[PDB]
Design a protein around this ligand. Structure first.
Ligand SMILES: CN1c2c(O)nc(N)nc2NC[C@@H]1CNc1ccc(C(=O)N[C@@H](CCC(=O)O)C(=O)O)cc1
Length: 638
């Protein structure tokens, strides 16, 4: 296929990609009438600056620019489709022409590429450019309305699907998602491409490139380079990297950081310097070539090019500068064995990582204050619960909106839109928790980075479990599997182990799920209720954790720690002691994380030895009188 050829080429030499088409068009200096051409002379809206209309109104200009860039030593050419989406063309009243526009852009690029290939023999590739669109999905249009978004995930998916249909019909060699101001739009584009690649179309190599705004190392949406790489890696892009907004000097540390994270190839095409007082990117090709040669000699990049200001002369010098340099060797084992999550910043859970706290208080069912604020519609104050949880050591936030008095998906969407408006709350990943999959999907469609999906199980059969897991894998998030199957909840140790193994071997084999993104939950259940059957639950959970961690490679273990101490509600000291004692054994067992009250967990040495011993008898069933002995001890505190 085409991906095999591109991979073979990238393993031997550095590939040169396009340049400043948007500036070469300004060098033509077309007026209003050239934009209209023959067909759009009757159009009632001005097409000034619509660089994508030239694929039909002035095809010769675009073809000649492609030819000049191609003879300037370039190897990959972007199609003239930066704003050819139905949303970007809305400012010009050409919503209905996106498919035709993309077909004609692909054709006019393909003719030039084929002619140059016939001239030189060196095969040239055409990359379909998917624009970021002026609409942002993670950034509110207005500061006063943080939860408001003027575009949704489904609309963006539909528009990008419409664009990529025309691109694929035209026969583009590569699909390129570039100048990403918001990685959520990149995820939507990947979603549309994944729909297309299974509905009719054969797969294509996928190129992704972000845009770092300034020296902060963060995109316009606030996410850093590692977070971006983690967020968009679920689509398995052949190449990732940066472009624009920074020269070849300021971009080097971020390219280093990104190349240290991804196992895919690194593509870098920056600006041609900085804007002068006259508005021109005046860095001569001599400095650009030497800077890209410095990038290549160190082994930072595998594809080089140029952003705005890169005339074909810049590409002509660069293709000679990087002619002899060896390609970058990717870190084929980059963070092997780790679990990669992301918010505005990367989050990693490796073999040596300590116990990971997941905040429980962002739960309508489980939290009193959060539920009281949510039913009142005061999400503005409800964000403070997540803020305080993060301030108290919670590394992931668990969001649950399941209630019969609330519209699930709408509340979940509003809260996930409000979360992204605050940086420190948004830098930690989210755990999307709901018994309804329509709420999990709504939560995933709003998240910027890579999140965790909670409460999926084998309850409704193997087929439904596989369908849900396939949808989640397409969404690219983490997944918590409950110990629940067709026969009911798993209470015994062997039942938990059987259910978890059956879930694991379906995901890994039938679906090809990533083994490091599976988080089994052996269903921590309440003890101390005074019922005989409610005594062994901690023991079965611990033994099942041991057995699962010792036999399922990569799979993590979590649990609802607060569920264990339901019988002692109101006696918060005993609840904290029980949580600490249970954690001391679960972490030793292999419990990687859990939905825990992050700020209310004590160290195993602090707990009073009498209370610690009583919790030990109750948890480990060392004494049938422990459940009453604990209450008897509690009554002494009055
Ligand atoms: C059901 N359980 C659970 C689970 O067992 N497994 C998974 N994967 N996920 C989850 N998520 C929900 C739940 C764990 N979350 C909880 C569990 C218990 C509580 C709780 O007891 N809250 C106290 C109030 C505490 C407060 O007001 O802050 C109460 O009296 O209800 C609060 C949150």
């Amino acid at each position: 296929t085409l991906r095999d050829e591109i991979n073979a080429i990238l393993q031997k030499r550095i590939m040169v990609l396009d340049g400043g088409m948007g500036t070469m068009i300004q060098r033509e200096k077309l007026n209003e009438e050239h934009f209209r051409g023959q067909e759009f002379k009757d159009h009632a809206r001005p097409l000034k600056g619509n660089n994508d209309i030239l694929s039909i109104t002035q095809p010769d200009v675009i073809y000649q620019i492609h030819k000049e860039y191609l003879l300037a030593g370039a190897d990959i050419i972007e199609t003239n489709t930066f704003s050819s989406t139905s949303i970007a063309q809305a400012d010009y009243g050409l919503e209905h022409l996106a498919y035709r526009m993309n077909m004609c852009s692909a054709g006019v690029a393909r003719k030039a590429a084929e002619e140059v290939t016939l001239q030189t023999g060196i095969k040239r590739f055409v990359a379909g450019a998917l624009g970021p669109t002026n609409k942002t999905l993670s950034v509110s249009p207005s500061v006063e309305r943080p939860d408001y978004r003027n575009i949704t995930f489904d609309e963006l998916v539909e528009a990008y699907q419409e664009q990529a249909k025309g691109l694929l019909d035209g026969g583009v060699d590569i699909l390129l998602i570039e100048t990403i101001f918001d990685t959520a739009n990149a995820k939507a584009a990947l979603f549309a491409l994944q729909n297309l690649f299974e509905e009719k179309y054969a797969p294509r190599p996928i190129f992704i490139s972000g845009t770092i705004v300034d020296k902060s190392g963060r995109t316009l949406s606030g996410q850093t380079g590692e977070g971006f790489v983690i967020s968009v890696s679920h689509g398995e892009p052949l190449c990732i990297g940066l472009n624009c907004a920074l020269g070849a000097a300021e971009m080097r540390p971020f390219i280093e950081i990104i190349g240290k994270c991804t196992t895919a190839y690194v593509l870098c095409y920056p600006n041609a310097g900085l804007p002068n007082t006259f508005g021109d990117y005046d860095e001569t090709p001599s400095m650009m070539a030497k800077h890209l040669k410095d990038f290549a000699m160190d082994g930072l990049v595998n594809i080089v090019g140029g952003c705005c200001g890169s005339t074909p002369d810049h590409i002509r010098e660069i293709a000679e500068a990087v002619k002899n340099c060896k390609p970058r060797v990717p870190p084929a084992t980059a963070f092997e064995g780790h679990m990669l999550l992301s918010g505005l910043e990367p989050f990693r859970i490796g073999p040596y990582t300590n116990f990971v706290n997941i905040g429980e208080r962002c739960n309508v069912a489980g939290s009193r204050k959060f539920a009281k604020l949510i039913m009142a519609g005061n999400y503005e104050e409800a964000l403070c619960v997540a803020k305080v949880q993060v301030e108290m050591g919670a590394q992931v936030l668990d969001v649950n909106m399941d209630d019969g008095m609330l519209d699930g998906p709408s509340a979940m969407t509003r809260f996930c839109n409000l979360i992204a408006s605050e940086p420190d709350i948004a830098k930690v990943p989210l755990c999307i928790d709901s018994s309804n999959f329509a709420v999990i999907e709504a939560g995933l469609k709003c998240c910027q980075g890579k999140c965790i999906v909670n409460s999926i199980s084998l309850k409704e059969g193997e087929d439904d479990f596989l369908e849900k897991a396939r949808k989640i894998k397409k969404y690219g998030a983490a997944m918590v599997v409950m110990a629940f199957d067709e026969e009911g909840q798993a209470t015994e140790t062997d039942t938990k182990i059987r259910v978890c193994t059956r879930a694991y071997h379906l995901l890994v084999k039938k679906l090809g799920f990533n083994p490091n993104d599976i988080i089994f939950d052996p269903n921590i259940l309440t003890i101390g209720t005074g019922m005989e059957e409610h005594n062994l639950y901690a023991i079965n959970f611990i033994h099942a954790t041991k057995v699962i961690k010792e036999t399922l490679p990569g799979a993590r273990i979590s649990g609802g720690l607060s569920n264990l101490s339901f019988s002692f509600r109101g006696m918060e000291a005993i609840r904290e002691a029980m949580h600490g004692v249970f954690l001391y054994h679960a972490i030793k067992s292999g419990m990687d994380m859990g939905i825990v009250n992050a700020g209310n967990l004590p160290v195993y040495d602090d707990i009073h030895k009498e209370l610690l011993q009583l919790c030990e008898d109750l948890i480990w069933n060392k004494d049938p009188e422990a459940t009453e002995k604990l209450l008897r001890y509690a009554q002494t505190q009055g």
